[PDB]
Amino acid sequence: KKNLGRIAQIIGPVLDVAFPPGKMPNIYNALIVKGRDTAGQPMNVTCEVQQLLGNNRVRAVAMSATDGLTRGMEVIDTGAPLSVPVGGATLGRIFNVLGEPVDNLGPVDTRTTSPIHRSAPAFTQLDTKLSIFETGIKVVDLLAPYRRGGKIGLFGGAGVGKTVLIMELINNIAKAHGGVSVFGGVGERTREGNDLYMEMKESGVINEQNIAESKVALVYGQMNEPPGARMRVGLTALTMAEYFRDVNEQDVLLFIDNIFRFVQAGSEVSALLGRMPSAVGYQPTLSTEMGSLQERITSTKEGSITSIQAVYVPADDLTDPAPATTFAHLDATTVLSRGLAAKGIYPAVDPLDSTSTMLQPRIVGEEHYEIAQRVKETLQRYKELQDIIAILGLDELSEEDRLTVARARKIERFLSQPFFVAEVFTGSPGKYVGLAETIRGFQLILSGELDSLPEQAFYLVGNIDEATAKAMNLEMES
Amino acid sequence: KKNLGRIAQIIGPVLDVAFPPGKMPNIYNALIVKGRDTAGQPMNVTCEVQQLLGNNRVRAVAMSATDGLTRGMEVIDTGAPLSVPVGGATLGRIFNVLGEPVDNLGPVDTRTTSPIHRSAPAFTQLDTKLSIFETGIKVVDLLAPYRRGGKIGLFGGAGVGKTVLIMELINNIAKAHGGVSVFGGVGERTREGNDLYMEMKESGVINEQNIAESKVALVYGQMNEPPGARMRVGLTALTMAEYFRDVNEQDVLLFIDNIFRFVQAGSEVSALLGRMPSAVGYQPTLSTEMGSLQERITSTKEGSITSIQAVYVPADDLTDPAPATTFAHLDATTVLSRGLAAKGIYPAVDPLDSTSTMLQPRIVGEEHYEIAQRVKETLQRYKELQDIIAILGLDELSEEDRLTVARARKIERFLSQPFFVAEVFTGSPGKYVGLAETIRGFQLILSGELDSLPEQAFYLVGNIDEATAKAMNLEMESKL
Amino acid sequence: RADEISKIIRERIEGYNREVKVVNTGTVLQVGDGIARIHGLDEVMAGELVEFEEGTIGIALNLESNNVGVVLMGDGLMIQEGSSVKATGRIAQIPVSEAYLGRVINALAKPIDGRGEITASESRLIESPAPGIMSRRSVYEPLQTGLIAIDAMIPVGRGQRELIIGDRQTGKTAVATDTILNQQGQNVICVYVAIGQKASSVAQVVTNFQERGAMEYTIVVAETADSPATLQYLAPYTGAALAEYFMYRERHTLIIYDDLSKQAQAYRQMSLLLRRPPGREAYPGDVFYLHSRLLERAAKLSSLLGEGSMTALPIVETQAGDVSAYIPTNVISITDGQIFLSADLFNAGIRPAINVGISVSRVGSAAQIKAMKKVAGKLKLELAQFAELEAFAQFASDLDKATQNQLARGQRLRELLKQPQSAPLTVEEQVMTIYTGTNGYLDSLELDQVRKYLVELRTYVKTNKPEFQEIISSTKTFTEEAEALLKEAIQEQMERFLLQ
Amino acid sequence: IRADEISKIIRERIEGYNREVKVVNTGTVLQVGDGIARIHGLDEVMAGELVEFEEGTIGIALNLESNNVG
Amino acid sequence: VDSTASRYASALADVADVTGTLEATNSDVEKLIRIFSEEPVYYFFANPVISIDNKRSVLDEIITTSGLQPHTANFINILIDSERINLVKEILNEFEDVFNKITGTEVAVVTSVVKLENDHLAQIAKGVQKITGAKNVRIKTVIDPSLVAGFTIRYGNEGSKLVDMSVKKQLEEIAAQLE
């Protein structure tokens, strides 16, 4: 017999349940309220024990809606934490925060299931394999290279291009990805969810028939979900991905979009739970709540989880605590800017801010490293001269200053590249351009052989050859 | 003593002890908690009653570490505020918050003791003399003439040079001062205190050979100590110096460093005691705390306590409440600016922000006043012009505009000086510069005699003949 | 031999059956996220470890009137409400011995490398008093970092605190790692405490150390972002005690806290979970005491105490260069000088991005030798004044020749201080570099040939003349004889660089 | 864990509860620290009225609370 | 303990002490405990929707029928007056401890595998009195079959301190081997 208890408090997701004097549930145990909606029994109302408030009663947060729960509902204790289906049954399906298939298809097999609460992998089981990875995004391949096996962050505000950027990365990588991917949406648009699902179907990844072979598993908690859900859907996707890694010995991708809603859901839950608030509104346990998520994502000696996590930066403030604590955990960050996004230089990556840890010669080659340092130098010098030119104009600068400013204009426009997934907004066919052409093109721009070309020749092109061809067109149109 | 209390709540250095019904300690009285050393022997931890809080319970701040002190322990009620040994038994000796010797020497002669918490002198008791003394620093002795028998102030962030400035001032004033100096170390680094002590030994101030021949007494409230010691070491050293001025009726030097750490400790202890937090985090009892220090520190008819104390300024913001509060009590104030410190001009006394109350014609002489006013005028013209130049260019200024710019840069150089203790930092030897030499040099540099010398010849020079000789050296170095 | 060792174990068992003692045990009341209010337990100390039903250690911090606020050193999952918890009778003791050399360990001194337990007999407390005024002496030895900038202008000495403060990806971890790795021939004990950092980052660090050779004399006190707040809070103090064991026994030590802001963040978290009042910006009031109690234990002990040392080089992070923040100003107040690393200087090419204008060293020439002091006593003030002279002479159109030559020499000086990653410079190379720079020899050749000429000159003195290194090593003074040798060599190499 | 409830006042009320009688003639000092003192009794004291502590310390009755005079 | 329950309980105990009627009040407190255990009683007396007048009137009838010490009836009227009536059960709990600490009759709880004789009871009573210094020792008897073979006694103002030897032996001898 699972011990049975009643409910005492209901204040939103917070549910205080009274349990028999002897046998109380432990922390993070799945509580299932019986529930009584219109016609029948909605047993789906699922909680997790968060605290123990003395006098044989505990505090729970609801992964579902709470409206309609009256005092006196019977509650069972599962005895084990929340466990979700893992393995090959999950491939090609959409799940929940609860692991219930909302894919409008058959049920999922509960042979092998994994709890959402698992300790981080040990220190002996990690690896130190420094590994490069090209994306075809020029700025990503040059000024902040991405690390195979390590976490990557799309730091940006709202409406700047994190979703388009991550979708472009998905198209570039997860298609030819030899492993098995897991896409988890922690608090994003149901529209984006449906759009990604439709593309995964029509592109053939989620095979309509033969759902046994899809190499992709979706786990979605949208923005209309209660905070108890939007705080654990990330853990759900994480357990599926780490099952793939630890058991099936494969490399796994994990595009999370976006973990700031994880943090925000945590804050909304903690204010309800009654903890003293940390910096201005966030939970006290923000660093540990974030790290418990992050440190389970790192690659291990069997498989590798190369996760690409968009992060929403509030009010375009990098000083806010959730960016301030995510910047630490991520391996390579890519800072988007609303300014560049408005000036049209897409993708809106801030070149100097987006600093990787892999941009080291021992990893990337001396030529790559040297051209990256020279681009960073010249963009820094232009960033300095911006204050002067704002008031004065480029006319008042020295010969070398005006040289560096012209080169920096050409550089910051050549960094721009049209994407395949933005082809509906730009109308221009996206270009894929890797490192062999990236380094060469930038070598040329910083050598100054192409100094005769205008600026608009480098705007929205993939190769330096396409830039030169556009220049020849700009001189054909007299 | 007879009424024994019981430890009831220990939250860090903020303790709660209950007493028998009608025998309760008084506010500011001292309590001795019969602690336990790790080996089973007692380890006596002193406290001081802060707040009688009802039901025979009092909240006392522990002047020592609270770890290891279980609940229900024994506590006594001594019946007095924290008393400290005063008189000649303090000369040459390093102390604690409680007046204990910590230089590992003989135990002090307890015989004369005087309780820390005492009142300020009355209004009839104030000495109203107005006179400046010579400190040997150019910018000080010209623009912020310190007031002999008053209260001076050193404001600035960390690393800008107020501890080195206070060491320079100690060096210049301590031995020339015919009386006794006192140094209260409040919230400062242990290696700072040790270096000061080793310098006071090597310089022969304490005269270790014959103790009770020293002219110095040392109280150190270091930063490793709990908030109680950092609160009360200032008042300890003040009670010692107040005895020195009261009955030994001699001039005293009372260097304090750092004085901000006292208000720091009050702010740390406030919220846990039960007070509601005020603005940015300081205690509600901030103005009266600073009063209970400063107004106790004053010069009277009998003795004169000259107090050169250094105020830390958090993040160089003079709007911060504790620096804002000290300003009202400090007669002569000097503000260190990170610009001057970072550019390499040392000492980094920001001249236009630094003000004294002594810089008045009848007191400093008309020549000294006029030259101080002209220096401040040229520097203010320079700073009001500097950003316009930074945007426009330098050519487009008038003759007098470019002239005053050059002279003000040269004056900004000449207000620098090599310090006697800053040898390890500069490399040059320190120069004592007299007031006559300063006034003369600034008169010359302002009139434009030296209006062709290199500005760099005015950098780290004591006198003005040294600046001329350094111009000669650079002129020959260019010719080679 | 399975039975004979079991025979000794049984011979112990017949003598180890029960010990009589009044174990103070109480009932658990509230269990939430690492904090457990406990009933009973009225004769427990402050900071005394309790052991729960699960085996979970705690620390009795808040001895309230009714209950005992206890922080868990781990998870509170299996701790059942109402289950009993026993007090231990100790206050944060850690085992310590020489075996820790090379062993990455947890904050509880548990080997996370899996190479077996540590043979540690003697135990030292986690929290200890700081060395008194007479239990120290003035810092006079230098602690070589290998970097020309830190080793010349803002020196660090054996027994000095020195803060590495800066932004993200500005080289703070690299500065600390190079300062550690330069110690391979100076015989000091290294400690690298990692507070709330990536497990992968720690793995990279221990790999770098193990393959470069810096593990014969290094320990790694690491716990990651997953670890509990109280472990992230106890890691620096445990590293300090581990270092201080050596420090008292006539050793020189070097401890790095990378980083401290994560420790203060964990301590803020546990303070706010104990419902203590939050001060300014959710940090408690006693965070200054938190950092100062840890930092004031790095000192240079006197001759009577064996003249042991412990140089602490903590690392903090400022966000967007906001030094005005609470913990940045606290640490720049407590430490003995600071080294500011700027992303501006980083992007602009100046690597390592030491911003010496707002960097200081509160020991001065006493953290150098006589040779480096003779060659670079005035260099910091002259370089700051030249930073002004070069920053101000962008407004004037035409300059007089003296200022123009000073400006060119300052630019040569700025090209000298560039140091690559994982490259230490010895004291001989540092002295000869500062000499050949400051004395105006590089005033002729261009800013880009400066560095290659420097490399060629040091290679030249190494191949040709050993007595220069012999002098600066054995005598440690830039004598007239050593300067004569050096000037001969500089002239020869300048001619060779010309003809080539 | 309430102010004004000192477990001696409850004793005095247990003795003299019979009906709630005017107690303005008297007044006792419950809690005193950092320049203020919570005072029992004084049920007819005005706001701003000088209240004179024994030993000679004048005070002013600023905020009259439920059962205690701050 | 600073809890309002403990405050009121200590006040009532000091009243009974200065009268000399400590046991007479203690009996009435044993009676009031088993009064307020019945849920309609405590609920009627605690819920604020119920008029203070008829609250006190039912209180008067309970005073008359049950029979209470004068000051204890006065005090339950005080609770109804001052609205600590939610803390009634807690006050009747804390009164036991404040009475024990007034009297020196410290309660020590022994739990063995079975019941024990008066000889062992007097032995543990003498032990407790010699190690604590309490003027009296009253022993609670509770059975605990989870122990293997031994006796376990707790004592203290709360049951904090404790010596025990049944299974502690097994744990200490398995730990020194599985170290």
Ligand SMILES: Nc1ncnc2c1ncn2[C@@H]1O[C@H](COP(=O)(O)OP(=O)(O)OP(=O)(O)O)[C@@H](O)[C@H]1O
């Ligand atoms: N490569 C691109 N070309 C043109 N426009 C782009 C590109 N990338 C992003 N954008 C602009 O960015 C806007 C939305 O970007 P996106 O949704 O990717 O970021 P986001 O709004 O932060 O994502 P989310 O809100 O889902 O977190 C669109 O209006 C689009 O015009």
Ligand SMILES: Nc1ncnc2c1ncn2[C@@H]1O[C@H](COP(=O)(O)OP(=O)(O)OP(=O)(O)O)[C@@H](O)[C@H]1O
């Ligand atoms: N002396 C140097 N020369 C060249 N490059 C350097 C030097 N020091 C550091 N770097 C570069 O700086 C980058 C970041 O260094 P580091 O990891 O030390 O910064 P960090 O402060 O630790 O960053 P975080 O804030 O993420 O901890 C490295 O990729 C390294 O290549």
Ligand SMILES: CC(C)C[C@@H]1NC(=O)[C@H](C)N(C)C(=O)CNC(=O)/C(=C/c2ccccc2)N(C)C1=O
């Ligand atoms: C009018 C809507 C908001 C009804 C609420 N529903 C919710 O807010 C959502 C659906 N949640 C979290 C619930 O399940 C109910 N709890 C509440 O938060 C609320 C919040 C609420 C606060 C104040 C006024 C109305 C509602 N319930 C009362 C609700 O039933």
Ligand SMILES: Nc1ncnc2c1ncn2[C@@H]1O[C@H](COP(=O)(O)OP(=O)(O)O)[C@@H](O)[C@H]1O
């Ligand atoms: N007169 C001076 N000349 C050169 N450097 C100085 C001078 N005064 C202070 N400094 C510099 O200030 C640094 C330490 O500042 P310090 O005085 O300790 O700050 P604080 O006064 O806030 O304690 C020293 O390293 C030293 O280089």
